[PDB]
Amino acid sequence: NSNVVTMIRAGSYPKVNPTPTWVRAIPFEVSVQSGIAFKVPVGSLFSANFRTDSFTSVTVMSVRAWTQLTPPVNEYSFVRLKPLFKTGDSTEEFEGRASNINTRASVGYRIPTNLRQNTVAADNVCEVRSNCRQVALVISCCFN
Amino acid sequence: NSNVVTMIRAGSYPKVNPTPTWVRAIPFEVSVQSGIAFKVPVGSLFSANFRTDSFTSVTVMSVRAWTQLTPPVNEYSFVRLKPLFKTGDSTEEFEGRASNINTRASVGYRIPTNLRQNTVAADNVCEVRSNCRQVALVISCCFN
Amino acid sequence: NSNVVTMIRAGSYPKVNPTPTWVRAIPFEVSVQSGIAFKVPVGSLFSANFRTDSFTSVTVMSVRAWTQLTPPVNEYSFVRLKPLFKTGDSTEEFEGRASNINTRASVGYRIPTNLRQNTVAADNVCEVRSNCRQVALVISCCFN
Amino acid sequence: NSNVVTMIRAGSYPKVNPTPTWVRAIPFEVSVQSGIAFKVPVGSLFSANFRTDSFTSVTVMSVRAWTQLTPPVNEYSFVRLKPLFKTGDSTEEFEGRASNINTRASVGYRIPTNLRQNTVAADNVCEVRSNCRQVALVISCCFN
Amino acid sequence: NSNVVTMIRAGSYPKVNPTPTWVRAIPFEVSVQSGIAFKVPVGSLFSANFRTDSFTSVTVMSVRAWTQLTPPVNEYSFVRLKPLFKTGDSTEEFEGRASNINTRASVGYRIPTNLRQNTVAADNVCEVRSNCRQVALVISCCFN
Amino acid sequence: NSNVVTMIRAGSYPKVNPTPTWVRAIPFEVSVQSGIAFKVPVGSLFSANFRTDSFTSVTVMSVRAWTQLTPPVNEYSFVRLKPLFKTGDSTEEFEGRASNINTRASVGYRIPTNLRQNTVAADNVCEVRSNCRQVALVISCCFN
Amino acid sequence: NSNVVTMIRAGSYPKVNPTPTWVRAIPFEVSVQSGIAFKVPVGSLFSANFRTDSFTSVTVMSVRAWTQLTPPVNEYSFVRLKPLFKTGDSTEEFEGRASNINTRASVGYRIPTNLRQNTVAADNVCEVRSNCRQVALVISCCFN
RNA sequence: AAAAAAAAAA
RNA sequence: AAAAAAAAAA
RNA sequence: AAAAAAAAAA
RNA sequence: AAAAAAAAAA
RNA sequence: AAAAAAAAAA
RNA sequence: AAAAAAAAAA
RNA sequence: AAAAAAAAAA
RNA sequence: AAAAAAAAAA
RNA sequence: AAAAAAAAAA
RNA sequence: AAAAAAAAAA
RNA sequence: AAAAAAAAAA
RNA sequence: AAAAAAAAAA
RNA sequence: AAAAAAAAAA
RNA sequence: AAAAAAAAAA
Ligand SMILES: [Mg+2]
Ligand SMILES: [Mg+2]
């Protein structure tokens, strides 16, 4: 290969964009209480911690969740996800349960193309329920 | 295609990274005086304006430059680029000139693999000379 | 096969080198405190314990890390690695988490060719964060 | 073939560079004392005697060395090279010896792509040891 | 690829040359007056500005010229080149004209093998005529 | 190729070994008196000078020897090797002689698989005889 | 190839001609007034400036014309050609116009074989009309 | 893709 | 169409 | 690549 | 039939 | 196109 | 085996 | 790769 | 090009 | 025969 | 017919 | 990849 | 191996 | 099965 | 015969 700087025969000034889109998998945790659904805000996704504080919208493609602390004594971990949408909330309760008490429960869902519109900080993604006091989510999305 | 949300049969918690790398083409302008070289600082590349303020290092791959204002009366535009490196500056003066007085001059250079190390804000990329008072650069790079 | 000593018809004196290079995977442990990053010194790699005390430089190729003690009560193990470089530090935080509370978390990263320069004892390799009080690293490197 | 001047149908003004790079094999000699290593300075490569006084940086690719005067009485010539690098010196001692007392000893080494960064006059290339009072080097390098 | 220094099994001392030849495209400008031919001296090619001040001879292969300033009001740029040779000057007047008043005129000629002998500083390359006050030349040549 | 750090999806903790074996060609010299056999100790192979002071055992595979100083006036160099073994010494006297007085003599022998057991510092490898006052050995061996 | 003079085994005296024909493209300019056709004389083609002053006849094959100075304010350039012939003039008015105000207009016409007879200095080639005050012609022709 | 100069390689 | 970064997939 | 003009060649 | 110069062409 | 003499070459 | 110089040949 | 001398083998 | 040791990989 | 750099080319 | 040791060979 | 229920399609 | 985002390329 | 380092080989 | 959703399967 070349071991020195070489000239590029540049042409006309190109189309440019200083502030592009970004396809991402974002990991974060939420605290959950027993018997109570937690609504996960979209605003969690915009943070210097993810390099995404310059965005104000996001298109969510899929949501996966894992229990993140141990379950109560005698119990296996479970997590349930209910999709929320601005045009009308769902009533599905997708659920995963652990089969070893020492292991995480997990589940996810995919958002179909027809429901991939933008959401902003004040919108919610899903409701989470669990017997564990924290849940770890990884959300696949398109910042724009 | 699917018109409804569907379940994903998630497995174990994956490897994650909240703060990934990003391959980018960054456009910005510098002011240049007649007969005087301008050293372009790497710090120009870290800005909320580019969504890159969370990074502190960058690996530069190539540099292209265009004149960005009109040249002096009677003259065609020119731009020259001299590569700078922390391990030893170059003395190449890659140059482009316009062939129509109403058109931009342009030139660029590629940095070979052996010289693609990180640079930080206090480092310089290149020296620019021109007969035009501003130069527009587009720098291809890897933020990390 | 031959069962006795046999003659070799040696020729001219060959090129020799009493002190060659060595490609290695080196295992060692570091102690980590909660909430605090630990900077792993390159100096840890030069030791009679690894037969490497005669080297003064090393080129690191990849870094893998495991948690080495159990996590706090109710938690799963995690480990994070942030690459460090003399020419500019990274801000990636590569992370692994366990999915069974009794199991190690692990993660690693590879160093690309353009960043494989020598490091010496006073340099650092990476920052480690964990909720476990010890982390076991295995570093693939070329002593020279 | 053509025996007269002929027209060239020139187009637009091309990209140009008055001060290009140059790939070279540079021959020079150093004086060496018995039992003492000599550090070879990079500055030796920049000289009007090689047409290279306009350069301030160089990328070294390989180093070859020969003994250049006769050895001490009763001895065969030897030469040893230890590579030096700004990011961390090596401890290899690549060695050639003569097999006829009237013949030069020689040896060399190649620098891998990952270590081919620029050096400047104040940097050193390698350490040389020999039982002969002069060593002849040929250095393959890229002036830039 | 190799990431460390490796040995080269050098043989006999090679043929060497500290002061090699160099094939180059040299860009420079000359000032031209209206109605008057400017003889371009070969001495313009030997300069620290081109890294060629150590040469005293050169073999010219081809000459290209562009107008470098705007033409007089109402006119299109033109440039003419007449080849000069120590053994007998030519009377060809190779000519380019612009077809857009804002654009450079250009033309060139090639010297055939039978006329490619050395020239020294006091020799002349060609005569230039133009309606523009500066002409930019690019000369392809073999310094020796 | 990749120009940035990338994640490695590490699994379970691997099998490791901080203190591996090493296959080597070790060069060293012994001083020899006329008419007198010199017994070469295995202990010569364990030294910081070869990076092998952390080993206590070695399996020798082959032995090569060259005369290292000039022979007596009027003579050609010779070297003889007699293999020695803890289970029973040999009486072979493998011998090389020079055919030019200015040139080294050389010879070697290979140890068959059935005799490749470990040796320690107090063991001897071979006896050397020569008309030259130093002999250079290169021993191919497996440190363990 | 041969590097010395060699013999030619010449035969009988050949047919010869001291004054041959010559196929040429001749460039010259004419001044034109607004609203008035200029008749281009064939005599313009016979000149020491073209090396053609020894001819008294020419066979014209084709005529091309370009405007040679800028057009009036607000206008695009145009040029029209009307072919003239000793046996009877044409009334074709072949016309080109510029599509950029800064650019030359051009047009040309070809003379068919049946009309390619000789012309002399007193004959006319074509009529030119333009809104520009000079027109540049290039005439392809056979001097005889 | 082919050619010249410098460098390197089997 | 191939290469690299992030993403997702069989 | 083909054609005209001048040269040269087998 | 191939080369070189000047022209012209797809 | 082959042979001899001088040169050069892979 | 190919090329240049000189010779000779079909 | 093949031949001789000593040994072993299917 | 094949075999050993260490490293890495699908 | 392939790779780098400087030049030239279809 | 293949292998080890010693010698010789292309 | 095949099968059952609901929906749709050529 | 295929698809999407940013990058670079023939 | 492929690559790097050290070793050995035809 | 192919596509979506719920179930079952190798
Ligand atoms: Mg000799
Ligand atoms: Mg225009």
SS (H, E, C) D4-73: CCEEECCCCCCCECCCCCEEEEEEEEEECCCCCCEEEEHHHHCCHHHCCCCCCCEEEEEEEEEECCCCCC
Tokens of E142: 């073999």
Helix (H, G, I), strand (E, B) or coil at F114: helix
Tokens 């050193």 locate to D124
User: Cα angle vertex E90, ends G144, G60, to 5°?
Assistant: 25
DSSP class of A49: G
d(CA B128, CA F23): 54
The tokens describing C98, both together, are 């366990």
Q: Given 3-state DSSP classes, what are the helix, strand and coil percentages for chain G, each rounded to the nearest 5? A: 5, 40, 50
In angstroms, what is the span from residue D29 Cα to ligand 1's centroid?
Answer: 25
Ligand 2 centre to CA of G101 (Å) is: 10
Taking the CA of residue B54 and the nearest CA in chain C, the distance in Å comes to: 8
Q: Which residues of B touch F7 (CB under 8 A)?
A: 15, 17
Q: Is the dihedral of CA D134, D140, D143, E3 positive or negative?
A: negative
Q: In angstroms, rounded to a whole number, what is the distance separating the alpha carbons of residues F39 and C86?
A: 51
CB contact under 8 A, C118 and D93: no
**Residue with CA nearest C1' of nucleotide I8:** A140
How do the residues of chain F divide into helix, strand and coil, expressed in percent and rounded to 5? Answer: 5, 45, 50
- Please report the resolution in angstroms: 1.8
- Given the DSSP bridges, would you call strands D124-130 and D38-41 parallel, antiparallel or unpaired? antiparallel
Q: Which of B83, B89, B99 sits opposite D13 (nearest CB)?
A: B99
The residue type found at G49 is: N
Which of F1, F3, F7 has its CB closest to that of B59?
A: F3
Give the up-direction half-sphere exposure of residue G128: CA atoms within 13 A in the CB hemisphere. Answer: 31
What is the secondary structure of G48-116 as a DSSP string?
GGGT-TT-S-EEEEEEEEEE-BPPPTT---EEEEEE--TT------EEEE-SSTTB--EEEEE--GGG-
Type of residue found at C117: Q
Q: Which residues fall within 8 angstroms of residue C127, CB to CB, at 6 or more apart?
A: C37, C38, C39, C40, C81, C82, C84
Touching pair C, G by Cβ (3+ pairs < 8 Å)? no
**Is the separation of the CB atoms in A144 and A83 below 8 Å?**
no
CB–CB of B17/F8 below 8 Å? no
Tokens of B58: 């960058």
Strand J contact with G38 (CB < 7 A): no
> Does strand I come within 7 Å of the CB of F1?
yes
Query: Stated in angstroms, how far is G6 CA from L3 C1'?
Result: 22
Spatial neighbors of F5 by CB under 8 A, at least 6 apart, are B21, B144, C83, C90, C92, C109, C110, C111, C112, C115
DSSP classification of residue F45: G
Distance from chain centroid for Cα F49: 14
The backbone region for F18, taken as left when phi is positive above 0, alpha when psi lies in -120 to 50, beta otherwise, is alpha
**Phi–psi pair at G48, nearest 5 degrees:** -60, -25
Decide: B and F in contact? Rule: 3+ Cβ pairs under 8 Å.
Answer: yes
| Residue C121, CA distances (Å) to C59, E75, F18 in order | 12, 71, 19
- Asked if C99 and A66 come within 8 Å (Cβ–Cβ), the reply is yes
Query: Considering Cα of D70, then D73, then D79, then D82, what sign does the dihedral take?
Result: negative
Residue F22, CB, strand O, below 7 Å: yes
Chain T bases having any atom below 7 Å from a protein CB: 3-9
The three-state secondary structure class of G117 is coil
Give backbone dihedrals phi and psi of B28, rounded to 5 degrees, phi first: -155, 165
Q: Is the CB of D17 under 7 A from strand P?
A: yes
Residue among C54, C114, B8, B125 at smallest CA distance from F6: C114
Nearest residue of E to residue C22 by CA position? E4
- For tokens 């480690």, the residue is C128
Is G27 touching E (CB cutoff 8 A)?
Answer: yes
> What is the nearest CA distance from E4 to chain C, expressed in angstroms?
7
In this structure, the number of other CB atoms found within 10 A of the CB of residue F100 comes to: 12
- Beta-bridge partners for E82: E127
- Give the Cα separation of E101 and D38 in Å (integer): 65
Q: How many Å from the CA of G7 to C1' of L3?
A: 22
DSSP E87: T
Measure C122 CA to ligand 1 centroid, in angstroms: 51
Experimental method: X-ray
Q: Which residues pair with C108 in a beta bridge?
A: C64, F8
Say how many C-beta atoms besides its own lie within 10 A of residue G73's C-beta. 6
Chain D touched by B99 (CB under 8 Å):
yes
Residues of D in contact with F102 (CB under 8 A): 100-102
Q: Which residues of D touch A1 (CB under 8 A)?
A: 113
- G131/K7 CA-to-C1' distance in Å: 30
Residue E58: how many other CB atoms lie within 10 Å: 26
Taking phi first (over 0 means left), then psi (-120 to 50 degrees means alpha), and beta for anything else, what does residue C65 get? beta
Q: Does C19 touch chain B (CB under 8 A)?
A: no
- Quick one: closest CA in E to C115, which residue? E3
- Compare CB distances from E100 to G27, G103, G136 and report the shortest one's residue: G103
**Closest residue (CA to C1') to nucleotide Q3 in the complex:** C1
Q: Closest by alpha carbon to G77, among G32, G131, G31? A: G131
| The token pair that represents F92 in the structure block | 């072979």
Answer for D21: CB within 7 Å of strand P.
Answer: yes
Instruction: Please count the other Cβ atoms lying within 10 Å of the Cβ belonging to residue E78.
Output: 18
Q: Residue D93 half-sphere exposure, CB side, CA atoms within 13 Å?
A: 17
Q: Would you give the distance in Å from CA G47 to the centre of its chain?
A: 13
Judged by phi (left if over 0) then psi (alpha if -120 to 50, else beta), residue C105 lies in beta
CB of D94 within 8 Å of a chain F CB? The answer is no
Cα C15-D28-B114 angle, rounded to 5 deg: 70
Closest by CA position to G120, among listed G28, G61, G45, G54: G45
Sign of the Cα pseudo-torsion (C67, C69, C70, C73, in order) = negative
Domains of chain C with CATH codes: 1-144 (2.60.120.220)
Other CB atoms within a 10 A radius of the CB of residue G2 amount to 5
User: A86: which residues sit within 8 A by CB, 6+ positions away?
Assistant: A117, A119, A123
Rounded CA-CA distance B100/E100 in Å is 9
Nearest residue, CB atoms, C16 vs list D76, D85, D95: D95
Spanning CA of C2 to C1' of N2, the rounded length in angstroms is 21
Question: Quick check: B105 and A14 in contact, CB under 8 A?
Answer: no
Nearest residue, CB atoms, F102 vs list D95, D97, D102: D102
Q: What is the sign of the dihedral through the CA atoms of C46, C47, C49 and C55?
A: positive
What is the C-alpha to C-alpha distance for residues B57 and C90, in angstroms, rounded to an integer?
6
Longest dimension (CA), chain A: 70
Closest among D91, D105, D93 to D135, alpha carbons compared: D105
Question: How far, in Å, CA of A16 to CA of E46, rounded?
Answer: 42
Whether the CB of D59 is below 8 Å from some CB of chain A: the reply is yes
Residue E92 is classified by DSSP as: -
DSSP state string for B31-69: E--TT--EEEEGGGG--GGGT-TT---EEEEEEEEEE-S
| Three-state DSSP class for residue C111 | coil
Tokens 């390619």 belong to G116
Amino acid found at F55: F
Q: Which bases of chain I are under 7 A from a protein CB atom?
A: 3-9
> Do the chains contact at D99 and F103, CB–CB below 8 Å?
yes
E105 closest CA partner among E69, E60, E141: E69
Enter the tokens of residue G138.
Answer: 């290039």
Structure tokens, G136: 């540049």
Residue written as token pair 């020492």: A102
Q: What tokens appear for A7 in the block?
A: 């000239």
Q: Does E100 touch chain B (CB under 8 A)?
A: yes
Separation in Å: O4 C1' and F20 CA: 15
